[PDB]
Structures are given as structure tokens and as C-alpha cells.
Amino acid sequence: KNVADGLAWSYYFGYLKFVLPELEKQIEKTSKFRSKEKFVKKMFILIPSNCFWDDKIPGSDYDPQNRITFEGNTEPLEKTRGGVFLRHYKHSVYEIKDGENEPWFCIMEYATPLLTLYDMSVAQPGELSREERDAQVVVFLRKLQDILEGDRACQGKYELVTFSPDRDLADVMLRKLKDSEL
Amino acid sequence: KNVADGLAWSYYFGYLKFVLPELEKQIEKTSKFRSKEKFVKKMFILIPSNCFWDDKIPGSDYDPQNRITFEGNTEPLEKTRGGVFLRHYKHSVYEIKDGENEPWFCIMEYATPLLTLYDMSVAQPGELSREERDAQVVVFLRKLQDILEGDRACQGKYELVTFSPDRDLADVMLRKLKDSEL
């Protein structure tokens, strides 16, 4: 009985399945983003091991050197799931310093279902102990991997980023941006 | 290994936990709603056994006699979960005919996580057969019940409504409105 399984399936069917194939095209609707070099177009999905975040990424405890900057949002995508309810999806673009070189642009987002694991561990410790939460993050990660890898339309459109609350996200992101295919 | 468990926990922590205690107060912000008699203030959470809906409730296949009418929305409640993202929650008010009597007002909403069960059964039939989906609806119902019944702040603020695609929702709702405490 893994609570993480329902969380991963819902994250996929209720969100990623339709935003990931369209992300690059949505980005390309903005001239500045068409003009920009070093703009990796994958969604970097952030999975902190403690299931927690409480603020904007720039200047946060994960950005101690202040090398991450909010640039702007992508053009919203429209989607109807209920057949009745229209929703607008957009993503945040961040600038990441690369020393004296041209800075990178990238798309970063926390995996929002992890808040449910966090909320559960604090409000219902009897249902989910701290150690059980740690284990469910790994389960969530592996299941989300299986799901996304099984969808050809999502291939090359995302990257899962796992890290400890002590890591420097700017350092983590620079390495991943440099290793990306673009 | 039940996918429904994560769906129920996330439906609660990401939504119901904070909208259910405030629902009556939100409704009371509208004079028309303060003035209206026969307005039951509980959220009626709709759980169709086939996990599916594709249109507005009024005049739908669930309202064959056209006795349900959209009245308006409640005043939005704002909430911040991530610490970063402000969201607005509001609910639909419906009028339900009661013969020649004063009609009822009520709050009705489909349990939106059931869409994930439906989407899964169609796109990944190998992961969730039709019969396994039927069973996960029951798991979802029982788990959501356990969760809500364990939260004193949610007591008396909701009612779960399970029904088959052949039932008349107007008939189902009239009986439940009459049996409500108000």
C-alpha cells in the first residue's frame, strides 16, 4: 500500500500528460524565448527529498549564492478535463548564472503532489512517519519514472531532479543544463 | 496496492481540508444566499460508479426531467499551499425543483480525482481493467470516508453521493436534501 502511486498517476493524467508535449511550442510563442540561446526547453521537475518548499526558488535556502532569477511565465495553454472546466497552465522561466558566460534560461517546477506527503507526515504522523515519508518519495520517483518513460509523447520533454535540502540547486541545475541535448 | 488511496489523501489535503470548514461562511457572504430558505450548506460530493462525467449537471443524462438548474457561484476563497502560489476556490450553487413547493438550493461537485481512474482505465487498460476500476471507486469511497470522519472540522460539512449512471440525480438529491439536518 503506497500512497505515492495514486499521487504519481494523478500528477501524470491530471497535468504532465498534456503539458509536457506542448511545452516547447508554448515557449516558442514568445519572441524573447525564440531569440534566446542556451534555453533548455525540458521541464525540470524538482523533487526535494524532504517533500517541502515554502517560497520562491530565487534567493531561497536552495539558492545560497543567489544565482537563480525569475524571468517570466510561458504563454498559458488551455485545457478541458471535466468537459466542463477550462483551466490555464503556464510555467515559470528562470535565469541561471554561468559565471561570465551567457546565462541559461530553463523551466523549473516542484512536483506539487509531494506537499500531500508532507502534509500527511505532519498532521497524521500515525499514518505516515518521517521514515515512511522518506520511503514514499522514492516510490513516487520510481513510479513517475515508469509512467513518463511509457509515454512516447513525453520522451525528452522532462527531467526529474532529486536533491537534499542541503544542496545548491544552482549548482545542480548548471550541471544538468550543460548535460542536456540542446 | 490501491491507486485510490493516494487519490483520496490528495483530494483531502490539497482541497477538501480547507474548503469544507469555510464553505458555509463563504456562502453567507452573498445576500441572496443569506435570504434563501431551503439552502442546504453541505458540499454534496458526487461519485458516479463509472468514474465519468462530460458535461454540466443541468439537463445532463443524470437530469432527465430537467429539474436541476445552475444558480451561481459562491464567493471565492483564497488559499496558499506551496507558500508561493495563490489559488481561488469557489463552488457552484444549483436549484432543485420540489414540485410546486419552494425549490432547494444546494452545493454539488464531482469528486475530480475519479477522472484519473477513468483516464487510466482507457489509456492503460493493462494497468487498470474495467473491473479493477469499479473496485478502486469503492476503495476511494471508503478511504475518503475514513479521512473526512477523522477530521472534526469537516463534520457535518459534506455528504458523499454515490450513484449509477442510470439514476436520476434530481431524485437522489431531493431525498438527500429532505433528509439533511437544516
Distance CA B122, CA B129 (A): 9
Whole-Å CA distances, A161 to A170, A172, A176, B95: 12, 8, 9, 48
Enclosing domain of residue A105: 40-182
Question: Which residues are CB-contacts of A30 (< 8 A; sequence separation ≥ 6)?
Answer: A72, A74, A75
A9, A92: one domain: no
- CATH assignment of the domain containing A30: 1.20.5.5200
Cβ atoms of A143 and A150 closer than 8 Å: no
Method: X-ray
Residues A10 and A94 in one domain: no
Query: What is the rounded CA–CA span in Å between residue B166 and residue B182?
Result: 29
Report d(CA B53, CA A147) in Å as an integer.
Answer: 25
**Residues B174 and B89 grouped into a single domain:** yes
Contact B116 A14 (CB under 8 A): yes
Q: What is the torsion angle, in degrees rounded to the nearest 10, for the CA atoms of residue B28, residue B32, residue B33 and residue B36? A: 130
- Whether residues A21 and A53 share a domain: the answer is no
Q: Please check whether residues B163 and B98 belong to one and the same domain.
A: yes
SS3 content of chain A, % helix, strand, coil (to 5): 40, 25, 40
Q: Which residue has the cell 439552502?
A: B39
Q: What sign does the dihedral B56-B58-B62-B64 (CA atoms) show?
A: negative
Whether residues B32 and B45 share a domain: the answer is no
Task: Render A87-116 in DSSP notation, one character per residue.
Answer: EEE--EEEEE--TTSPPEEEEEEE-TTHHH
Q: What is the DSSP letter of B60?
A: S
Identify the CA nearest to A102 among candidates A151, A39, A13, A24.
A39
Same-domain pairing of B33 and B46: no
Number of domains in chain A: 2
Chain A residues close to B56, C-beta within 8 Å: 84
**Chain B residues with a Cβ under 8 Å from any Cβ in chain A:** 1-10, 13-14, 53-56, 81-84, 110, 112-113, 115-116, 119-120, 123-124
CA A20 to CA A16: how far, in whole Å?
A: 5
Q: Is B167 annotated as a binding residue?
A: no
Chain A CB contacts of B55 under 8 Å are: 83-84
Closest listed residue to residue A62, CA positions, set A174, A176, A166, A173: A166
Q: Is the CB of residue B33 less than 8 Å from the CB of residue B27? A: yes
Contact B116 A55 (CB under 8 A): no
User: Angle, to 10 degrees, between the axis of helix B114-123 and the axis of helix B130-149?
Assistant: 160
A145 lies in the same domain as A68: yes
Could you give the C-alpha distances from A171 to A66, B14, B33, in angstroms and in order? 11, 31, 54
* Lookup: cell for B51: 468514474
C-alpha cell at A98: 554561468
Torsion angles phi and psi, residue B100, rounded to 5? -90, -5
Q: In this structure, what DSSP letter does residue B167 have? A: S
Q: Are A167 and A121 part of one and the same domain?
A: yes
Rg over alpha carbons for chain B, rounded to the nearest Å, is 17
CA A141 to CA A124: how far, in whole Å?
A: 22
Q: What is the CATH number of the domain that holds A124?
A: 3.40.50.12100
Q: Does residue B131 sit in the same domain as residue B49?
A: yes
C-alpha–C-alpha distance, residues A121 and B126, integer Å: 32
DSSP string, B95-116: EE--TTSPPEEEEEEE-TTHHH
User: What one-letter code names the amino acid at B141?
Assistant: L
Nearest to B5 among A3, A56, A150 (CB): A3
Helix (H) or strand (E) holding A74: none
